[PDB]
Write a protein that binds this ligand. Structure first.
Ligand SMILES: [Zn+2]
Ligand SMILES: [Zn+2]
Lengths: 229, 6, 32, 229, 29
């Protein structure tokens, strides 16, 4: 198929825009070419049942949660309208992240390999739990609560923690002031900058594993070179 | 004219 | 697939199309 | 920088959209992506002095003159009738178009300079007839303006006119006739050598050139099912 | 180049872009 060949070519062009050593972010002067590409693939009939290449899921996770290589805290100081916490968007994000983890696992089936695999697993569970949790927080901060989609969301994505989901459900039946109290409390306790860090490390980890133990190139050369010290 | 052929 | 109803009608569907829409949602959110 | 990798990728994608077994035309569906690619290349400092790959001069000429196939008694796409009103007869544009057609003949000759020779000589004659056709119809467009723009008319006749004085003295005389008379003259020479024949000559020159370059160099212009056939 | 590191568009690709826009606008108008 000529449209197929054209589409693959458009993917190759996106690699050169999306694959980062650090994390992808949208730059204004690339907005036109990146959007034209994403739209062509978006309406290309031949791509309708093709697999999403891992680098796009990754670049999407980076764009979507606005990942920086920033630490949780700045070192000698005390303690964000960028993430769109919308149910459908976040559900698709968790899908793409799940896909990232499955590609990673599948590749992982030299002295550092079990360690990197295990860190990835721990980081992935923690990141998924955090995303699911902040989506829940966003549901609970609305009045009235969209109970349908809230309930559905928790059921698709809260199986890692069924017992907390129940709790969330009961919390979802208290007056707005109770809900806001609880949510403010758990955000102050465990702020998003944590989960930014966890997601960032998950992703750079996964990039490294894929680059080293498989065919991928995620521009982790400098890190690979440090690891062959 | 012009520089024609067949 | 073989006979995807969305294919037959030529409607956009699938993971690239979903990615496109989510991408635009995020980008629009990050103006106003 | 990364700009070079990006630009070379964008150029490869364009190659995928531009090289056609027949003639390139720009469908509505590719218009945004082709435009984003041309713009990216057109603002990249990396590319400011790179040589235009000839496939782009060929696509530009196919586009600019709305080239339609006119056949080795082959299979047929669903195309349209020839028409010089899809063609933008403007001095700057057509002057540049003649430069690019010259680029193409230049690389054709560099190729043929390391059977073959009937291809080469067919190309030579096609080229002269096409170049002439374009100049003739640019002339016609100048003569149908009121008032005539004499400056650009003459600069053009100088640059591209193979016209020795038997023609452009006659052309100047004709130029300062009253408009209705110029219109009569033009309409007579238009009927005496219609655009359709130059569409044929230019189409055949381009296809002949494509074939030549794929066959005697490492160009691929999807001519393979034409080669021994 | 007196325009390269002035940061100004020029060269074959830029001219290609301008010309292509002319043709496309014509075919639409
Ligand atoms: Zn389908
Ligand atoms: Zn320059």
């Amino acid at each position: 198929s000529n449209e197929k060949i054209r589409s693959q070519s458009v993917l190759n062009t996106l690699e050169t825009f999306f694959i980062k050593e650090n994390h992808y972010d949208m730059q204004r002067e690339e907005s036109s070419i990146v959007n034209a590409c994403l739209r062509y693939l978006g309406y290309s009939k031949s791509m309708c049942h093709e697999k999403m290449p891992i680098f796009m899921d990754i670049a999407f996770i980076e764009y979507c949660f606005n990942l920086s290589l920033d630490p949780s805290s700045f070192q000698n100081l005390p303690i964000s309208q960028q993430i769109l916490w919308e149910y459908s968007l976040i559900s698709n994000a968790l899908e793409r992240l799940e896909n990232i983890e499955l590609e990673r696992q599948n590749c992982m089936r030299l002295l550092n390999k079990e360690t990197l695999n295990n860190e990835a697993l721990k980081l992935y569970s923690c990141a998924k739990a955090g995303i699911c949790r902040w989506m829940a927080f966003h549901f609970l901060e609305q009045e009235p609560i969209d109970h349908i989609n809230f309930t559905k969301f928790l059921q698709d994505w809260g199986s890692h923690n069924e017992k907390e989901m129940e709790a969330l459900q009961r919390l979802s039946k208290h007056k707005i002031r109770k809900r806001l109290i609880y949510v403010s409390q758990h955000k102050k306790k465990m702020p998003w900058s944590k989960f930014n860090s966890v997601l960032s490390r998950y992703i750079q980890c996964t990039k490294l594993q894929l680059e080293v133990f498989c065919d991928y190139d995620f521009k982790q050369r400098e890190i690979v070179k440090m690891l062959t010290s | 004219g012009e520089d024609l052929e067949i | 697939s073989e006979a995807c109803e969305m294919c037959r009608l030529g409607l956009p569907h699938g993971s690239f199309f979903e990615l496109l829409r989510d991408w635009k949602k995020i980008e629009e959110f990050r103006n106003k």
